[PDB]
Amino acid sequence: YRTIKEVVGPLMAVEKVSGVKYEELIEVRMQNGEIRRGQVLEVQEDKAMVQIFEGTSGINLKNSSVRFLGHPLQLGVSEDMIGRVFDGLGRPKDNGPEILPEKYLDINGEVINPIARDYPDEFIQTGISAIDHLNTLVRGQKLPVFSGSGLPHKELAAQIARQATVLDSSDDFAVVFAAIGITFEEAEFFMEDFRQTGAIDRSVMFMNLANDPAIERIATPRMALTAAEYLAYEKGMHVLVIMTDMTNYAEALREISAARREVPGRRGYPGYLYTNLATLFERAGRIRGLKGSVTQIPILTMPEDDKTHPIPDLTGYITEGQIILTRELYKSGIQPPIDVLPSLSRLKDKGTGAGKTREDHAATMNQLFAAYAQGKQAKELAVVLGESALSDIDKIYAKFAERFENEYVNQGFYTNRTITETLDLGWELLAMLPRTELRIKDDLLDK
Amino acid sequence: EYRTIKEVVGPLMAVEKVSGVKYEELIEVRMQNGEIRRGQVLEVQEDKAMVQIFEGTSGINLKNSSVRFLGHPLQLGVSEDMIGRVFDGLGRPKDNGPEILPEKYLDINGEVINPIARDYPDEFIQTGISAIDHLNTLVRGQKLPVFSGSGLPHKELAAQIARQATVLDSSDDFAVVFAAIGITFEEAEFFMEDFRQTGAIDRSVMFMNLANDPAIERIATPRMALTAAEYLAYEKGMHVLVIMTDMTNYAEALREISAARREVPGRRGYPGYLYTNLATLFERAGRIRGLKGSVTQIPILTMPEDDKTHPIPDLTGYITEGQIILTRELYKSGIQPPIDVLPSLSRLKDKGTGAGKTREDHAATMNQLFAAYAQGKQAKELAVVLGESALSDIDKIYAKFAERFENEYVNQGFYTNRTITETLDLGWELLAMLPRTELKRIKDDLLDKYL
Amino acid sequence: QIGKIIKVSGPLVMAENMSEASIQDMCLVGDLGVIGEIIEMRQDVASIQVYEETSGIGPGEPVRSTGEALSVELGPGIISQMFDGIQRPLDTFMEVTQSNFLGRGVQLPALDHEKQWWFEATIEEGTEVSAGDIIGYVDETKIIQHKIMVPNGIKGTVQKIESGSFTIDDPICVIETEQGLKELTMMQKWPVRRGRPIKQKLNPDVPMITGQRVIDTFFPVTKGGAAAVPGPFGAGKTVVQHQIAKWSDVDLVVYVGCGERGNEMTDVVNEFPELIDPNTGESLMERTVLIANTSNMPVAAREASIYTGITIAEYFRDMGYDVAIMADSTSRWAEALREMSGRLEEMPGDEGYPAYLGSRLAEYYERSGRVIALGSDQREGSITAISAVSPSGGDISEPVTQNTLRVVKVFWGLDSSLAQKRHFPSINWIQSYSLYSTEVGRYMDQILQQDWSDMVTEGMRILQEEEQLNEIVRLVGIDSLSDNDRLTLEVAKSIREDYLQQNAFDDVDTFTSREKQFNMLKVILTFGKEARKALSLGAYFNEIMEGTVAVRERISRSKYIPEEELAKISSINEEIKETIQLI
């Protein structure tokens, strides 16, 4: 079609088209011969609005032309994807083979029938005491990390990816890792860690940087999840999906939304943000009759550390708990800087116990939690009283709380803790406290 | 002359079927009743023209009116003969004095000084007020603002710096440009009398815009003044001091036009371009390679609720080279002017100090009387309810220092002119409190000067 | 093709009959012929963002495309110049216009096309060359070699070539390509909105030797890394950007004054020709490029300066140099994006700023970093982005700072009560951070065979202890405070007033050598640690402080130590082990 009529920002108006579909992909043949890809945002009567990924510079309208491709964003799937790196459209970034796909799938996916899902059952050893014990990740769960700019979620993410294993007989997790709008530095950290550890031979990477077009940013998670469902639900694999940084996904959303001239809802973000988010995070779980599964760990920075911000708020309504990193902990050299009190896993119950973990999991977990709560309270009240409100019976909680943070939670981003070691440490810690602190007959069994 | 007014919407008019109209051109409406009103072209398109009428459009009948496009923007008629004359916000004669046949007409926006051609602010200006001349020095070409509040004596101080400002050569090549922005007739007349009473009028050019004049003419006032300042500095070689009050009034006007034009509000109600706008004023101050004479700026603003971070003082601060702060804790007592030296800054103090500009002793005694006062202001602040009243032989002469520091030295009265010598002279006998050893530094290259 | 103005509405101008042109094409607007860029096109009608004031222009006047996007000339006679936003050199401006004022419509080549330069050829005839290959060099300065590279988009062999004296317009090389013969000059143009291509980005792992104690020690930036400097007015940013600019072990400085004060730009061309690098012994200007778009200059050209700067920085990066780029202030650039977006009637984002703000900042900070430049030689280069930010009310929660801080790893926060209370440089040792600390740790401790990171950790830990004891003095009082904790304050006192504090207008405290830094901190670190050992042996805190006053505050003047030979403060350590055997 030689009919470009308007170019406004990164948007194009194309006239006298027909057969054109919403979200359909297009190619621009520019007057110099250059080709740019784009996507239909709007389509009315015989005209169509397109956005161009690589922006709109250099174009002479009169002498360009658009081709309509007859299919939206798709992923060319195949098992050969394991061990590879792509950009946020699925194009190779590792100078390896051109992958001959099995088929091309719409990256929007399809919604899982609510009565088709299976309850998540099996405990995932992340090897991080604070999650494994106090906020257990379970296979098929959606459990995100809420962090802030500057905070080492990056490190936490790589660690979960290296260490995550099930206690079963397999197979190993396949990791699908989606980087979304991150700096080259962030991304280069991930890709070297994965190469270093050999975690790549087990992974599929989708890398999309900050200087990448905001639409591609938007596509990135949908690409990764399409890959993950394919590996899981067609190839019977257990897939662990890690995504950073969802805040970036959101920022990209406002950008396109502004461009489509939409009208923002709560706190500047789109009305449809919720549906969008759920649309991502519900692509997860076990399915009846199917061997494979998808477990999500979305990662996101909380704007101005604000819990009520739409991004963390809506994510919380959709996911089954969350893991929080605080600045108070990070600055105090604690790694991983997980605050347990606001952290939660909703599916932990059936995931743990005897034959999952050990007979004492729940018990220590509640006690450690309650004890830590009292210790923070002792330290907080050391502002006014300073000392002497805890002469004997309450001294210990302050000390406890300190060491709980220093030994138990702070474990190092390269330290892999078996659930045995985690639980053991927790008792070796609870021992500080006098037995009048209630454990059961088993207070004398694990002592 | 076009009898083709299409549309009138509030102060705004649409004229169509026109040709040759340019953005920001002046216009005149000739109303059906013979009345003439000036305006300007806000937008131009095809054969249409969108204009704002300064005095508004009340009373206008579209069909029987007509528009004249004058073929120029807002201009000032300039001449040496401005000195000793009084004008309104648009440079129309206000004092009923002689007819002005001007040399050339100049666009009040002026032109940006090439950064390369610009000369660094330099050389001292004698104000007559210690706390500025000795501690936050006014260099030639400086933009040094005065922040204030309502009911504070910023007005009283303004006209003083008009009388008592001069260079160490002669006051014949020194001229004041006074701009009042959005002030009461009574405040206006306060400035009329003090200038006419002290004769300092015949070195000044005055631009008087009142609270009840139209907003657009408030906006035009500082650019009128600065056009005259740039003229007399760079075309006539004078050192020009420009006093503008109140910049808070300027900002409200700007905000009133913004909302009238239906523009999007920025921070705290005010236009997103408040910064840039102010910048186009405050940056007119300076010196230039080769050419003699300068333009110095002293804008006065009242801080709303005395909030430092308010868009007005905030953006002033990011543009101007320092600030003179007036506090109410000092104004409670007779302290005049009440200038708290702690947040007061002159980022270009050194460039107006030293041997041959002021004195061999200036620089050192400034940071001496400053560093010691920091400990005193706190000592006197330390109440008998904390407490307490048991500060040692260190702070029975440090708090006695900060107490005598205001009442006598800074508190100099609104009519006392202190020649730079007098001020420096009072610094010695005033610092004759402690013994020599408590004063650092430095010693042996001095150690007296003086002494 | 003659265009024709159909609408002038502020910096925005609309022209019919513009169909032969392209989006982003620069064009000459009106009878004045003012600089403008096409940003939209609807049919034959171009929307133009004008980089000069449009006052006095109106419908019917002509508009001509240049058929070229916003570009810079890249070649010799760039180093040491002062350009404006669109790369007009300001001194030639003065001369051609016989004026001290920015007049509209003026058209200038950025570089002196008449100057004879000496071309020393370096590649022999018959070599296969492609983008980024050096064919010869020019001694542009005393120190800097202007290395002449094949432009991007050229491929083939060197037909003819010789050393000689030429202008930048004279063809110095002939290449037979795939199309045919193409002759190159010492000059190439590049569109500023497009990052110059590279082989690949590298992880920036080598520390900047700024010499500014606080920065190098606690908040280091790597070569290729990026720092932010946000703060209020009167923070001192300016008297700090200078320090970075003068001392960093880089090869070139690009110092971009985006929309700040005019006077400050003069101060630079005054003080930089006087700032002599010892050893090299030639002025700082000899290694600096200035771009100035002052606060009262056209708003639309604010975004022009930012891109002009960084594109120039990319050029020298490509020659295998380390460059530092100073953008000041980046708030005024975002402010210019806010203004255009309003005029274009776009959907606003936070605080009115456009929804593509973050992207913009991201696109900019990612053009910085450490690379392997193009060319067979596979040489390596870097750009180090230092940006001043000027948030409203000094409040950092603002959108420009927040979007910057999610793409940069270094934050040098300027407080008000530091500058106001004479603590230079005004840097928030609590709030600030460098996510490079860890990696720089590995680098130093290994370069010194020392435990310097362990020292760094211990110092920061002491400043973070002092922080909560100060909010505890605000209670019962200093009088009732324990021995070991009284010591914690007087070690922090030392760090604040001695280490962190630095004078820019001093003959020796303006810069601190890497090893001079190492000794000072150790001189602090043994003091604190050994005075601790006196407390746990039964000597009261008071006894120690009165016990050493002169020799303890010989460390107070130890920031003023020069360097006749290298060894200077290599003395106080075995001298503290003296009073620990005495007191």
Does residue C42 belong to the interface with chain A, where contact is any CB pair within 8 Å? yes
Structure tokens at A62: 């009169």
Cross-chain Cβ contact B317/C233 below 8 Å: yes
Q: Is B302 in contact with B148 (CB distance < 8 Å)?
A: yes
Distance (Å, rounded) from C-alpha A322 to C-alpha A343? 6
Phi/psi of residue C434, nearest 5 degrees = -140, 115
C238 annotated to bind ligand: yes
C235 annotated to bind ligand: yes
Distance (Å, rounded) from C-alpha C304 to C-alpha C333? 9
* CATH number assigned to the domain covering C115-184: 2.40.50.100
What single-letter DSSP state applies at residue A232? I
Neighboring chain C residues of A209 at a CB cutoff of 8 Å? 366
Does residue C176 belong to the interface with chain B, where contact is any CB pair within 8 Å? no
Cross-chain Cβ contact C356/A6 below 8 Å: no
What beta strand segments (E) does A312-428 contain?
321-325, 338-345
In three-state secondary structure terms, C191 is strand
Rounded to a whole number of angstroms, the distance from the CA of C407 to the nearest CA of chain A is 6
Distance (Å, rounded) from C-alpha B56 to C-alpha B12? 8
Phi/psi of residue A242, nearest 5 degrees = -110, 130
Bridge partners for A118 per DSSP: A286
Structure tokens at C354: 């456009």
Cross-chain Cβ contact A57/C23 below 8 Å: yes
Does residue B4 belong to the interface with chain C, where contact is any CB pair within 8 Å? no
Cross-chain Cβ contact C346/A6 below 8 Å: no
Cross-chain Cβ contact B116/C90 below 8 Å: yes
In three-state secondary structure terms, B131 is helix
Q: How many CB atoms lie within 10 A of CB C430?
A: 13
Distance (Å, rounded) from C-alpha B131 to C-alpha B108? 34
Q: How many CB atoms lie within 10 A of CB B149?
A: 17
Does residue A119 belong to the interface with chain C, where contact is any CB pair within 8 Å? no
Does residue C265 belong to the interface with chain B, where contact is any CB pair within 8 Å? yes
Bridge partners for A172 per DSSP: none
Q: Which helix (H) or strand (E) holds A28?
A: strand A25-29
Neighboring chain B residues of C91 at a CB cutoff of 8 Å? 116
Closest among A438, A358, A437, A367 to A404, alpha carbons compared: A367
Structure tokens at C407: 């793409």
Neighboring chain C residues of B117 at a CB cutoff of 8 Å? 94, 100-101
CB neighbour list of residue C562: distance below 8 Å, 6 or more residues apart:
C508, C568
Q: Which of A13, A214, A333 sits opposite C359 (nearest CB)?
A: A214
| Technique of determination | X-ray
C231 annotated to bind ligand: yes
Maximum Cα–Cα distance for chain B, whole Å? Answer: 86
Distance (Å, rounded) from C-alpha C337 to C-alpha B110? 25
Q: Which of C40, C42, C366 sits opposite A210 (nearest CB)?
A: C366
Neighboring chain B residues of C506 at a CB cutoff of 8 Å? none
Q: Which residue matches tokens 């639980």?
A: A423
Q: Which of C355, C363, C464 sits opposite A255 (nearest CB)?
A: C355
Domain ranges of chain A: 1-447
C211 annotated to bind ligand: no
What beta strand segments (E) does B238-348 contain?
239-245, 287-288, 295-302, 324-325
Does residue C464 belong to the interface with chain A, where contact is any CB pair within 8 Å? yes
C233 annotated to bind ligand: yes
What sign has the CA pseudo-torsion C572, C575, C576, C579? negative
Cα distances from C195 to residues C25, C221, C310, C312, in angstroms, run 17, 22, 9, 10
Cross-chain Cβ contact B20/C394 below 8 Å: no
Q: Which of B111, B266, B279 sits opposite C102 (nearest CB)?
A: B111
Does residue B261 belong to the interface with chain C, where contact is any CB pair within 8 Å? no
Distance (Å, rounded) from C-alpha C419 to C-alpha B268? 26
Q: Scan residues 355-414 of C and list those with Cβ closer than 8 Å to B.
A: 390, 392-395
Q: Which of A7, A192, A214 sits opposite C40 (nearest CB)?
A: A7
Cross-chain Cβ contact B283/C262 below 8 Å: yes
Q: Is C180 in contact with C168 (CB distance < 8 Å)?
A: no
Of 3.40.50.12240, 3.40.50.720, 2.60.40.770, 3.20.20.70, the CATH number of A1-447 is: 3.40.50.12240
Does residue C263 belong to the interface with chain B, where contact is any CB pair within 8 Å? yes
Neighboring chain C residues of A210 at a CB cutoff of 8 Å? 359, 362, 365-366, 407
Q: Is C317 in contact with C280 (CB distance < 8 Å)?
A: no
Cross-chain Cβ contact B115/C292 below 8 Å: yes
Rounded to a whole number of angstroms, the distance from the CA of C263 to the nearest CA of chain B is 6
Please tell me what resolution, in angstroms, this structure has: 2.8
Burial class (CB in 10 A: 0-12, 13-18, 19+), A101: middle
If phi over 0 gives left and psi between -120 and 50 gives alpha, with beta otherwise, what is residue A298? beta
Cα distances from A357 to residues A346, A409, A427, in angstroms, run 17, 19, 15
C126 annotated to bind ligand: no
Distance (Å, rounded) from C-alpha B243 to C-alpha A212? 51
Q: Residue A384's closest chain C neighbor by CA?
A: C475
Distance (Å, rounded) from C-alpha C90 to C-alpha A307? 51
Distance (Å, rounded) from C-alpha B91 to C-alpha B79? 12
Cross-chain Cβ contact A7/C359 below 8 Å: no
Domain ranges of chain C: 1-70, 71-114+185-434, 115-184, 435-583
Of 3.40.5.90, 3.50.50.60, 3.40.50.12240, 2.60.40.1730, the CATH number of B1-451 is: 3.40.50.12240
C435-583 belongs to which CATH class?
mainly alpha
Could you tell me how many CB contacts below 8 A there are between chain B and chain C? 156
Q: How many CB atoms lie within 10 A of CB A289?
A: 7
Cross-chain Cβ contact C94/B114 below 8 Å: yes
Does residue B271 belong to the interface with chain C, where contact is any CB pair within 8 Å? no
Cross-chain Cβ contact C7/B44 below 8 Å: yes
Cross-chain Cβ contact C267/B120 below 8 Å: yes
Q: Which residue matches tokens 């300064």?
A: B54
Question: C-alpha angle with apex A342: A339 to A345, nearest 5 degrees?
Answer: 100
What beta strand segments (E) does C167-280 contain?
173-176, 181-184, 188-191, 200-202, 226-230, 252-258
Structure tokens at A51: 């956005």
Structure tokens at C135: 């064919």
Cross-chain Cβ contact C366/A211 below 8 Å: yes
Cross-chain Cβ contact A255/C356 below 8 Å: yes
Q: Scan residues 76-135 of C and list those with Cβ closer than 8 Å to B.
A: 82, 90-91, 93-94, 99-103
Cross-chain Cβ contact A211/C363 below 8 Å: yes
Question: C-alpha angle with apex C425: C423 to C426, nearest 5 degrees?
Answer: 70
Structure tokens at A118: 């299976």
Does residue B111 belong to the interface with chain C, where contact is any CB pair within 8 Å? yes
Q: Which helix (H) or strand (E) holds B183?
A: strand B174-183
Q: Residue B387's closest chain C neighbor by CA?
A: C477
- The letter for the amino acid at A168 is D
Neighboring chain C residues of A95 at a CB cutoff of 8 Å? none
Does residue A304 belong to the interface with chain C, where contact is any CB pair within 8 Å? yes
CB neighbour list of residue B112: distance below 8 Å, 6 or more residues apart:
B283, C101, C102, C262, C294, C296, C297
Q: Is C267 in contact with B378 (CB distance < 8 Å)?
A: no
Structure tokens at A277: 């988010």
What single-letter DSSP state applies at residue C207? B
Cross-chain Cβ contact C263/B120 below 8 Å: yes
Q: Residue A15's closest chain C neighbor by CA?
A: C43
Distance (Å, rounded) from C-alpha C134 to C-alpha C378? 11
Cross-chain Cβ contact C347/A261 below 8 Å: yes
Provide, for chain B, the percentages of residues in helix, strand and coil under a 3-state DSSP scheme, each rounded to the nearest 5.
Answer: 35, 20, 45
**Span C71-114+185-434 CATH architecture:** 3-Layer(aba) Sandwich (3.40)
Q: Which residue matches tokens 């009142």?
A: B210
Q: How many CB atoms lie within 10 A of CB C183?
A: 12
Structure tokens at C81: 């110049």
Neighboring chain C residues of B283 at a CB cutoff of 8 Å? 261-262, 294-296
Closest among A195, A296, A321, A308 to A246, alpha carbons compared: A296
Cross-chain Cβ contact C355/A184 below 8 Å: no
CB neighbour list of residue B429: distance below 8 Å, 6 or more residues apart:
none
What single-letter DSSP state applies at residue B95? S
